[PDB]
């Protein structure tokens, strides 16, 4: 509703059946290694290694589910409090910004929501496990309802936003009305006129503005 | 195909409130160790809260659009067998008429 945000969120159960190394870690926007599901819970705020297990488990009777959430707890036992947690994400506080901001942001990236960022993260590590314990068919990446398709609107949307883009940082140069007017027009023109959906002049989902067919009405 | 159309984009707020006003416990005041039959809410991939008996919740809604108080493109779906309730104001959805 304002961006494109290409920062996607990974959360993987290490160790296959017969490995007892089944540590659950996560890889997060702007952070190299993968962070134990536990560490990330503490830098959130949920601190007692067990306090967290109610965020994961929506019925503390899935004994087999809990028995896997065991290593991770010891995996990230070495860090116990909130402070300790995000220094391992490296003054170094910067980690609180990165969680607050570029992370699970389809929620709000106002700080104060630290309890639906977690009660979600769990909800993810939850659904992951139902498939590990064959009480779930892994989803259908070829499932249509799960696919969206932009039409002309959204497609101008990306272009118009990413266009007005370096319009306003060109007007930030009118200091150091008489602003630029061509670039919004000749921009829009370009893409609707190349099919290489603009993006300045570097190509990019080429072949998206196609000239209409006229050999019969039906066609 | 012919009778297919496509979603336009509707707004979410005036229904995430229509939930607060019909059975939705936000989660900062949620821990499941007193409520496991807690069914979950989803609007465009956001978990806003929790409700108990969805019966007349998902069925007071399904006659809410039917009369027009909610927009007819948004799609409402609860998964009994997994106690979840996803709602999409999304823009991109390929609805058919039935």
């Amino acid at each position: 509703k304002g961006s494109r945000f290409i920062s996607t969120l990974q959360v993987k159960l290490y160790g296959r059946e017969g490995s007892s190394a089944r540590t659950i870690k996560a890889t997060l926007p702007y952070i190299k290694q993968d962070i134990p599901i536990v560490i990330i819970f503490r830098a959130l705020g949920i601190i007692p290694d067990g306090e967290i297990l109610e965020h994961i488990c929506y019925d503390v009777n899935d004994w087999q589910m809990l028995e896997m959430l065991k290593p991770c707890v010891e995996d990230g036992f070495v860090i116990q409090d909130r402070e300790t947690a995000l220094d391992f994400i490296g003054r170094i506080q910067y980690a609180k910004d990165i969680l607050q901001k570029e992370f699970l942001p389809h929620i709000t990236q106002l700080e104060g929501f630290e309890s639906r960022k977690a009660f979600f993260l769990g909800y993810m590590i939850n659904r992951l496990l139902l498939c590990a314990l064959d009480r779930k068919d892994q989803d259908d990446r070829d499932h249509f309802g799960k696919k969206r398709l932009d039409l002309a609107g959204p497609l101008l949307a990306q272009l118009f936003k990413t266009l007005f883009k370096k319009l306003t940082k060109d007007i930030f140069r009118y200091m150091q009305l008489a602003i630029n007017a061509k670039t919004i027009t000749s921009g829009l023109k370009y893409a609707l006129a190349t099919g290489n959906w603009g993006e300045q002049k570097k190509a990019s989902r080429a072949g998206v503005s196609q000239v209409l067919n006229r050999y019969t009405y039906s066609s | 195909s012919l009778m297919s159309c496509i979603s336009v984009g509707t707004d979410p707020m005036p229904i995430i409130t229509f939930l607060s006003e019909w059975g939705m416990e936000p989660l900062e005041d949620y821990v499941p160790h007193q409520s496991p039959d807690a069914t979950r809410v989803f609007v465009n991939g956001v978990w806003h809260g929790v409700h108990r008996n969805p019966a007349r919740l998902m069925e007071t809604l399904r006659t809410l659009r039917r009369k027009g108080d909610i927009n007819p493109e948004v799609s409402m779906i609860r998964d009994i067998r997994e106690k979840e309730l996803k709602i999409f104001t999304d823009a991109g959805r390929v609805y058919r008429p039935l």
Partner: peptide, 24 residues
Amino acid sequence: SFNQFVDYTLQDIICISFGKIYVT
């Protein structure tokens, strides 16, 4: 798609302070 673009979701993109916008 175009209408809903033009009408509303075009205005949304105004964030020396920009306000309501008209197209001919």
